[PDB]
Nucleic acid binder design. Structure first.
Ligand code: MG
Ligand code: MG
Ligand code: MG
Ligand code: MG
Ligand code: MG
Ligand code: MG
Ligand code: MG
Ligand code: MG
Ligand code: MG
Ligand code: MG
Ligand code: MG
Ligand code: MG
Ligand code: MG
Ligand code: MG
Ligand code: MG
Ligand code: MG
Ligand code: MG
Ligand code: MG
Ligand code: MG
Ligand code: MG
Ligand code: MG
Ligand code: MG
Ligand code: MG
Ligand code: MG
Lengths: 79, 205, 61, 86, 81
RNA sequence: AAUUGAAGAGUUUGAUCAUGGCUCAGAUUGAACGCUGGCGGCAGGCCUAACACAUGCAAGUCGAACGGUAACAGGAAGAAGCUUGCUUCUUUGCUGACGAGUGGCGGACGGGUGAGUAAUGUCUGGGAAACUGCCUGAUGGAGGGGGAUAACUACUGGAAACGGUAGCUAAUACCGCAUAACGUCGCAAGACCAAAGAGGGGGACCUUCGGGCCUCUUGCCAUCGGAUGUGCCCAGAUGGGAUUAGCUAGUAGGUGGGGUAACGGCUCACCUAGGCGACGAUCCCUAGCUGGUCUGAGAGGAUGACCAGCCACACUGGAACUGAGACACGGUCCAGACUCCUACGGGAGGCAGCAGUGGGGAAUAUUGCACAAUGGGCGCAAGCCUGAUGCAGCCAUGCCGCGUGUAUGAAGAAGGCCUUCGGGUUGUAAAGUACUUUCAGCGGGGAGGAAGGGAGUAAAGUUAAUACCUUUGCUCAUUGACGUUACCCGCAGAAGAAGCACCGGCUAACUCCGUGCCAGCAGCCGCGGUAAUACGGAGGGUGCAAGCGUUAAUCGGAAUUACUGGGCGUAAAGCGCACGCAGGCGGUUUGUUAAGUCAGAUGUGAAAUCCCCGGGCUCAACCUGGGAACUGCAUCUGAUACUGGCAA
């Protein structure tokens, strides 16, 4: 199986692209609490179908634009 | 690097003999051991806990002729070694080549044994060692070189040693002038007036 | 502003001195001493104890 | 310079720069001829210019003036131009 | 070329070379790829004064690594034994 | 086995509790300064001006690519002698070789510095759209020509630097032509793309005696694959400030063209109006990053000197050229500031390479020796170069070790100080006696760092071929700067070798005299006004010791930023009170998921350093072998109680 991630779309204004917010669950180094941290990845989107607020599953690939190295694989759900 | 001062002042300070003289005669007729040295000797000294710890450290150091930096290295090594730190420190102190020579009786005092060691009159396992702080390991055969077997120092030292207690963990000869260092001496075997947890606490301070 | 220790100095104006830290308590704001015996701040005349603190060479035995 | 090897290398670098500039200008001239053939619209002229060009860029790639990747880039780009031209 | 050579460590007057497979451009005591053994020139007798990892050295030679002169002598002597 | 480790004290008050700061006791340093200073080992030594540089050296090599002969050796002839050829002398590149030149490789490494750089860098993990000289394996091919141009010759410009014109010559210099493929392009048909020879020996046959001809070594050129190196992308982490809140116009995306070795707004045109930011964007101030180092019980905190990995820079600001690799420390070009030469037209240079000079500063070293070793460049090789590196020089800068004597020795000697004047202390201390000689001084002997390489042979292969050559052994004579090395023996004699701080409490160690809130001490409490254990001197004592203190700096103590590990009624501290988005947290049962979580495995987490078990320097410092550790991260396989999601 190939490495991948799964996140939530926050913007689809880009043409043939989406912005995906991926939340990770990191234990704080000092205080030991498990804090939410969210990374925003510009995800390539051929066809352009994903909407704002859907759970999409993405994979790293070669660079595609200035800030787009990730791309879709499948849409987990529609929202 | 060596305390080249009067010796009995140290014994007078600590209130007890440190064997800094040969032992041909009792030290009472050589110094007022009951009285601390100096103008204010009869003064009754109320010592603090730090006073107690400091004097204990000094006493043992003066006995073996060790200076503070070297003794601190001994303490660090004893703490590092497994087991009881105080007994490890005492064992490391006993392992010193000058002390081994003293115990085996080739020196009337530890200063005499130290000069014998430093003048290449002592061999270990056959090789000449002139390091007064060489660590003697188990089973070593501390010897006297042939060109130094004829010194009246060694004789007088042997007949002075014979009238004291014989260290169990050693085997000495007066003819061949060798000694097997059977084992490491134990805190139980050594003199029980030395209270080394005072040194331990002091260096933990 | 620098304190000058010792028993009497010989520092006139324009003297080239070497100063070190360590304030003087009873003096307002004086936060430095002058190292005796350094460049011009010559040693105290006729000391016998703590000569190294006042730049006095060992008197002959 | 101030080292004999540096001086000799400077002379050699200048001479090689002149030679390589000559060859590079020739290669660019032929590629530009091809490109003008496409952008003027003609197809047979474009293909003929491409056929004249291709040995030049391949020979220069072989000699090291450029890289075989660069030669392939020019070749593929111009061939796609010809075939889309019609 | 990747070379198998001696990086000198130890102290003054007492060398102690480590046989390392490294790029020939790096510094002598600098970046290496693998440590394949050691050599003590003042090795006292009874102690293993020279140890080479001949399987790894052969691996590197097969990969094309060149062998320094002193390392070649050490390999000859060790495989002679 | 890879650890076993955690101290408090003073000070607010008439006194006591508590809160709370301030201060001291410890460890350490790239240290400086004061006093003092015997030896050795190992290490370290411009932290400031990335300020300016006199001077010498720090990158060359190859005649086995080439023309050639400037010099040397000088063999023949010829010079031409009585030396009958050891006369300078003339010719011959004839030979060994080799200045200068073409050409190949190196100069992009090694070495220095931390100015810039707060994330276009670094660390960790993961990738794809990639080049990679020398090295290596396999597959192949190495045919045939052409025109040059240095060198040199002649003329000639310039003060010089530096050229210019005409003529000639060689190549493994350069360019065609032939030949292509599993190579490029193309769907395919098909089209297209390279090369360089040199050296050693040899029969027989050719022989213009060049040489052909035959084998051998090596080099050349496609192409594919390995290894190393490098380029590129993503994620997390990587300082302070919010009294810096909005920033962005190729800006974000798309398409198409161009460009790179390679993906890419890398660049351009057009079309969309986006992109980032309260999980801190933008701006501002400092700053190289890491392994690690210091401290700490630990968590942490501070810092990243030496050593090693990465990056960046090379007088300042820019550019590209050659090159496999640079936008290049000792290369080019341009501009600029300095400095120097000039014939006034013009030129030259760049120590943050080693050493060194000036200056700055509290402060940091020799204008040394050698390529013997390790490594590097070139070379088939010898060998040449190497201020890398190995050593040595100066410095107590640090760590470690050793010595300055050992004992016996009361006449408790004198002297000194205190005295209650009776004595006590200095003090077995000295003197005296006997003994030893480490280290330093002198003399004698003497490891190891030395492997290789040179000559010849034996074998072995090769090949007609004992010939070369390539291995492998074999005997020979050698290769060490350090270096009068480490070390060992002998000498003569205690002989050449102890100081610094402190003594009111904290804090180990106490009395006289001088001074009289003065002189002064001081880290805090404080001390000093005529009996000062606190100032200064003396005796005595304490601590440490070739060091000892002061200062600077960090952590500790400080639970005094409290995650481990604090508080908020009155000591500082609950918003005046509510509502409430984001955010934090979430009652109870079943099912499912496996994110968190846990377990196991795999890959990495460089080496060194720390730690454990050992080994070697006479021990230690130091150097090493092996382990452990590197708390991490990425997958994979399980558990799924608890949290999370999902559905009831
Ligand atoms: Mg010492
Ligand atoms: Mg120039
Ligand atoms: Mg500097
Ligand atoms: Mg350069
Ligand atoms: Mg060529
Ligand atoms: Mg800076
Ligand atoms: Mg703590
Ligand atoms: Mg400069
Ligand atoms: Mg190029
Ligand atoms: Mg460089
Ligand atoms: Mg330079
Ligand atoms: Mg310099
Ligand atoms: Mg100055
Ligand atoms: Mg030798
Ligand atoms: Mg006290
Ligand atoms: Mg008085
Ligand atoms: Mg704390
Ligand atoms: Mg509190
Ligand atoms: Mg109040
Ligand atoms: Mg209050
Ligand atoms: Mg309230
Ligand atoms: Mg719940
Ligand atoms: Mg490690
Ligand atoms: Mg649940």
């Amino acid at each position: 199986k190939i490495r991948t991630l799964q996140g939530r779309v926050v913007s689809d204004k880009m043409e043939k692209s989406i912005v995906v917010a991926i939340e990770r669950f990191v234990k704080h180094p000092i205080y030991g609490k498990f804090i939410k941290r969210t990374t925003k990845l510009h995800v390539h989107d051929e066809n352009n179908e994903c909407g704002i607020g859907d759970v999409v599953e993405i994979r790293e690939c070669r660079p595609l634009s200035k800030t787009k190295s990730w791309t879709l694989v499948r849409v987990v759900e529609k929202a | 690097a060596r305390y080249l001062g009067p010796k009995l002042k140290l014994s007078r300070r600590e209130g007890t003999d440190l064997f800094l003289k040969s032992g041909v005669r009792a030290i009472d007729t050589k110094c007022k051991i009951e009285q601390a040295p100096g103008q204010h000797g009869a003064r009754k000294p109320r010592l603090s806990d730090y006073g107690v710890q400091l004097r204990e450290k000094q006493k043992v150091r003066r006995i073996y002729g060790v200076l503070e930096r070297q003794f601190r290295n001994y303490y660090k090594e004893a703490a590092r070694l497994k087991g009881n730190t105080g007994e490890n420190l005492l064992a490391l102190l006993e392992g010193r080549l000058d002390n081994v020579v003293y115990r085996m009786g080739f020196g009337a005092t530890r200063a005499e044994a130290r000069q014998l060691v430093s003048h290449k009159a002592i061999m270990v396992n056959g090789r000449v060692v002139n390091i007064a702080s060489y660590q003697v390991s188990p089973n070593d055969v501390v010897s006297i070189r042939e060109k130094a077997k004829k010194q009246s120092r060694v004789k007088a030292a042997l007949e002075l040693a014979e009238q004291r207690e014989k260290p169990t963990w050693l085997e000495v000869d007066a003819g061949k002038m060798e000694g097997t260092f059977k084992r490491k001496p134990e805190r139980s075997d050594l003199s029980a007036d030395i209270n080394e947890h005072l040194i331990v606490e002091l260096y933990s301070k | 502003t620098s304190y000058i220790g010792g028993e009497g100095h010989n520092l006139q104006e324009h003297s080239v001195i070497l100063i070190r830290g360590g304030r003087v308590k009873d003096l307002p704001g004086v936060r430095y001493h002058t190292v005796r015996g350094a460049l011009d701040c010559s040693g105290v005349k006729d000391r016998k104890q703590a000569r190294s603190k006042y730049g006095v060479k060992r008197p002959k035995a | 310079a101030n080292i004999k090897s540096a001086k000799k290398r400077a002379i050699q670098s200048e001479k090689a720069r002149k030679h390589n500039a000559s060859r590079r200008s020739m290669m660019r001239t032929f590629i530009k001829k091809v490109y003008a053939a496409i952008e003027a619209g003609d197809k047979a002229a474009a293909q003929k210019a491409f056929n004249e060009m291709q040995p030049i860029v391949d020979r220069q790639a072989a000699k090291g003036l450029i890289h075989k990747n660069k030669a392939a880039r020019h070749k593929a780009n111009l061939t796609a131009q010809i075939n889309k031209l019609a | 070329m990747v070379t198998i050579r001696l990086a000198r460590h130890g102290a003054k007057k007492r060398p102690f070379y480590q046989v390392v497979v490294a790029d020939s451009r790096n510094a002598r005591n600098g970046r290496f790829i693998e440590r394949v053994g050691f050599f003590n020139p003042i090795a006292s007798e009874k102690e293993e004064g020279t140890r080479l990892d001949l399987d790894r050295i052969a691996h590197w030679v097969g990969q094309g690594a060149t062998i320094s002169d002193r390392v070649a002598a050490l390999i000859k002597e060790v495989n002679k034994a």
